[PDB]
From a paper:
In the Siphoviridae SPP1 phage, the tail tube consists of the TTPs gp17.1 and gp17.1* in a ratio of 3:1, with the latter being generated by a translational frameshift adding a fibronectin type III (FN3) domain to the C-terminus of the protein. However, virions only containing gp17.1 are still viable and infectious, indicating that the additional C-terminal FN3 domain is dispensable for phage assembly and infection. gp17.1 monomers are unstable in solution and spontaneously self-polymerize into long tubes in vitro which are indistinguishable from native tubes. Six gp17.1 subunits assemble into a ring with the inner 24 β-strands forming a β-barrel that defines the inner lumen of the tube. The α-helices are arranged almost parallel to the tail tube axis.
In this work, we set out to expand the labeling strategy for long-range distance restraints to further methyl groups, as well as to integrate the NMR data with a 3.5–6 Å cryo-EM map for hybrid structure calculation. For the collection of solid-state NMR long-range distance restraints, we overexpressed a set of differently labeled TTP gp17.1 in E. coli, purified them, and let them self-polymerize into native-like tail tubes as detailed in the “Methods” section. Hence, these samples deliver a set of restraints that defines the relative organization of gp17.1 subunits within the tube. During structure calculation only the structure of a single monomer was represented and refined. The structures of the other subunits were generated by applying symmetry operators to the subunit structure. We represented two stacked rings in the structure calculation.
Residue numbers in the entry:
A (entry chain D), B (entry chain E), C (entry chain F), D (entry chain A), E (entry chain L), F (entry chain B), ...: 5 to 176
The structure:
């Protein structure tokens, strides 16, 4: 079925007006929760509790913050400046009659949480409501991230290419 | 008694008007909860708390979402378009004076939950109320699924039948 | 003292009008809870919080449902048709000046819960209120169940008595 | 200090009018909880939250019920008939200027709970309020129980004294 | 006392409905383990840890698999088709008031293990639980195996009776 | 830093009028909780939620009760007679410009809890509010307890000094 | 990304008027929680739940208290005298176009918690609200602490430099 | 019975789409382990622990890796590229109504282990789970390996056929 | 250094009140284990894992039980009656400024183990905790045992001194 | 196949930025362990336990430490300074379309172990995790070590070339 | 490489304030174990399991205790009084640009173990944690022990120099 790595979530800010949506690395986990409100109280009749109602749609996003990357800075301007961000969640498996497959919306920063612990690494919990996320097919592959997600491995670096802790440095 | 695999749940959408009910693969677990409201307050009399009342009937359904299958797309049109779905829960053990045995109702999408984690695979929690599920015998076997639930095993494929990750491919 | 297997619970339906109470196999566990309401608020006086009040008596019953047996079908007509059932809880140890020893009442189906999981077997949680359970001695032994509860073991079946998964089959 | 076996609790019923208090075997554990209500709201003054108030005194008692013993039947008439019971909690260690040491009160049966499980043995949770338990020295040793609590061991029974599951039978 | 060769174990399948139980050659060793669950926790009382409880009865069977013989094919349909098998363990020494002496039950295939090594020969470890094995006297001698277990030795074959690796061939 | 054994808590009763504060042995653990109430509701202004307010100061004390010792009897007269007790919490590490270092207050017995279990030993949970605990330096060392806390070990007792379970008896 | 040791938190008191902010050793963990309040109730319209609102910003700080150090004494005057403290949280990794990187605010002592246990060492939980923490770059390195955080190790001390439990003593 | 050399294991990759399954030389040993999950907890009833359940089927494979051969390169693409491999285990003894006899499945690379020691030769431990291995008859003899397994011996090479360490070289 | 025979262990019971400590013959071996609990979790600071803590001190004693000797009967009253015993472990080599050298404590009988085997002789494993064993110099030589430990050899007995299996009998 | 001496492991440090990877002499043995995480729980479906997952890749390295050589000093700066090291494992047998054949990665020092014993020589156990080792062909022969591994033997030294314990000294 | 006798371990106590570190004779063996904690959970990303973490550094020391020598008495005051000891481990082979080569730290007595057996001689197992051992060059040779470790042999003593069991006595 769909794998845990398969569904990934990208956001595009409204004010940027750019042709691309930053997504942030080191994801922890993603809960999108969607409540469809229903009829109150049957009155012991013919079923007055199976009726239509409004939908309350909210999601939370947890990840580990990196020192300085752009979806996080998008989140930072999102919460700290106070803007809504465009919300995209797509699947990495290629769509057979589209680029990718997505669910889309406009979202807000309901709350943000920052944990610093003595073990592990900094963890951000960001919670958001949305006014109705809709499903569609994803057009922008953005093959740097969704298409290409590598383990950092590269074939050799044996003459010494000025390397460091990162998974491939070059000489100067 | 009845096994955990024995009771399986199929839904048929109202708008489809088809002669068959899609059920979805990769089930996690099924809670159907049925509350029969009773008399308030004995008044220290002869028993004024054992009296009849209305019934609140609600169930939740958890499963792992597959990339694109029809009960899930039935769920997707169920929640996202906003429709009630016909609710069938039957037992795989053959009925001796019926095809199968069932409990049936008309149900609504009270809430849906979608979890994406770094481990495991995508998990959907869908919660629904119903206006009174009733018990009957199941007429439609649908022997593709209830009758036939295989492990994917097949006897050999040894001359090379263009195989893949799926449990039986054929040449082209 | 009294063992976990020692206290067993039988129900007799009101409408049946039969000389025997069906009890259901594969019990999980039984909670009977009895609240005796007391005086409110001493007023820092001589003890105005040790005073008499009404009693709220409710119990829940958990068990694993078998495909088709009669106490369960008694439960099924109990909840699904909407009837109160006569409530008997007796002890398997023989009473020395009675057949058995019991607590008795008339009970209602406040709620029923049905769990289907991928592991294990179907589990029913049924919750009920009662209007005052009373203690007495149990007259009906019903020696098929209370008196006789066997492990299914039988001495031999060695010439082949057309056996199956059940603990004793006979030839045809 | 005081051991877990050291503090034991006996009750004497009001209506019995006997010169002895039944305590029940197979104790699980005993919580006596005593709340001394205090002044509301300092008003940021000189301390208007350290002031005297009434006391709410309640305790719960858990034990494993034996088939038929008298403190349990005292509990049974306590709850089921609806009476208050005199409450004694004493220490097994001998008092140096009294028989024993006790805390005493008059208590009521606020609630009773009966659990039957498939494992283990029947367990009773009984909850009670009291109108002020007071501390004193215990006069009645009742040396059958507090003074004498044996493991059931006896030196030999080797010529055969018609024995059973109990820790000492005699011939007929 | 009873020898290592003395106690041998035969199984009869439920579905066969035959008048005889296949046992398999080349036994390695047989562990039958039977746990009688007891009372929890004395509470430092009169002995609340010597009390009765349920019994967990499980056994494992190790043997060396032969290319094609019927108890193994009984095991193979046992595990691979998924059936319970009737369980017989009898003693080779003749019973003085019965044919043989046995312990009997109905058993299931909890697990099977197959080892192929470069040394030695294929070894099967099969583990099973049972719902209560009972002791009785064995009625069916089956004198081909229990009564008769020969070393393969035969007096002569000197004119040439078309012999092979097996312990007695005949001419064609 | 400060160790778990380092901070110890002594109480002095108001009515005693003695030159010394009893502290009780066999401490379990000490929670002192101090809430400083703040401004409600910024009104999205310049910060109307960072404003000063009153302080709610409460602590709970858990320990294992000894048969008869004086801080416990101080607690007993504290709760059961109904008095406030003077509250001292000091550190065992010697102060360099004082005897010891302390936090001090006047405290009340908001609630007391007594647990008797079948395992372990009697445990008292006592909860108290205070009208503002203040920090100071501790003047009274009380070197019997804070200064001197021994394991009970003594060099020898080899000619027999009429010993018992306690860590040093003498002859008569 | 950012490590658990990487983000550290310093406070500067308002009244001190000094050119440096004390931070306290032996940190346990730091939760900063920031709630951005949003529009109530869509009314099933065009999205009236994605709207702007106020922000509730609160954090809690846990650490192990040392006998006498200045951020703790800053905390002590913070809570016990009743002052707001200036709030700085910076990252240890050097900023490439600033000294360091920080988030800054003015904060208050909403609550303080002090735990003394028999195991481990004294633990302080301090909770605070803030009226809007803002992100900036950190100017003051304070290289004693952020820049320099050593394990206490030093190369040798072999002629005897009057040493103690601390990680480097000198002769007198 | 079946010998240690008798049962040999071949794998065929899914993506290859070839009419033949590579098996790897220098086998160490093969464990195939198959767990058939059973009913939990009898409840001291009629046997609620002899019931059907799912099957967990896993095997491990140990061998000594050769410099470059195709089943190992099949294993290498299996683990390192991340593919499932078709799993065949057949017996070398000729089947009397089939080519050979087999057990078959689709298998995955759960783990791989590579040991390099100073003694002996490189040893690979590869562990795999399977979703249900089934038994059948083996159709492909592959007489190069199963049918023909020689010691490397050849009758003579006495005029000098440009020989080396391998068991038969030819001139150039 | 210190030999295996050099360190020997004597116990003195508390209740005896005698001027001498029985030690038991036929020692097997003695483990005294002493755990000094330390600081949890550095927090990657300056070393918060090198800190002081409590000490858990426990030892086990193995020996071969003799039919009736007094340290064993001291052990027997120790465990079976339930008393703590005074614990002495001294060295046989003479102290140069004391009689002997010792480590001393008060000890309890945490567990006792008795093995009877078909080979060898009865073996007792007794395990004990202690509340802090301290080191000192041993005052009581007890020269019968520590000072004098002979092989049982005596110069002659040649006129016949009514001898037996023991290493020196006398006439009657 | 591949010999125990055939596969050897070289590391190159990231910070060095040199055109060569130090490997360390006196290898003991090398375990590289690679776990490919799989799907949880079939749910008794079509095989939901044969699914893809992440890979946990870790290895341990044991060797005997030499007084001062550069891979060990690379290890020493690796662990003691705290750096990741580039990980190369190649085979000594010449590749036919490459220099050598390798598996490569970036690795970290998860743990180091140093044993000093009275027998034998110092032994270092170093354990490391890796984020995905990949297989390739080895480009750098480094013919000093991999290509050339001599026993220390040299043809003669008979006029006296100022020799010592080492396998070839020269005059001064 | 480095021999088993080559690396020896000396300790210097903090409180002594002396210009020399006692090491203890009759070493058994020395394990120093150093764990460098790493990143949790890659999240199937670019390698989030190769990240930096804290280091847990602990060692154990086994030796045979001598009747009275100073490192042992240093150990004895170490554990029994409760002090940390300065930790030095150096190599006996002369450093070419230092006196010797060392690894150094401050260490604590986590646990001590004392075994007395009937065979052999007293054996002490002492276990310790450390807050980060660092490597350096050893300055103090202490040529009595490291430089000079003799077998006890001396050329002659033939006129009788009042000798004993020790390897050289003199006349009186």
């Amino acid at each position: 079925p769909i794998m845990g790595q398969d569904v990934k979530y990208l956001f595009q800010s409204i004010d940027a007006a750019t042709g691309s949506a930053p997504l942030f690395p080191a994801y922890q986990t993603d809960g999108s929760v969607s409540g469809e409100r229903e009829l109150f109280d049957e009155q012991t009749k013919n079923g007055r509790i199976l009726g239509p109602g409004s939908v309350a749609d909210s999601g939370e996003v947890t990840y580990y913050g990196k020192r300085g990357d752009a979806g996080q800075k998008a989140i930072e301007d999102a919460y700290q400046n106070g803007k809504q961000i465009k919300f995209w969640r797509v699947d990495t498996v290629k769509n057979e009659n589209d680029k990718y497959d997505a669910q889309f919306g406009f979202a807000y920063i309901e709350s943000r949480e920052y944990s610093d612990g003595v073990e592990g690494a900094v963890e951000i919990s960001i919670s958001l409501q949305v006014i109705g996320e809709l499903k569609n097919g994803e057009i922008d592959t953005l093959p740097e991230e969704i298409v290409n997600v590598s383990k950092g491995g590269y074939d050799f670096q044996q003459p010494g290419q000025t390397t460091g802790e990162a998974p491939g440095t070059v000489p100067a």
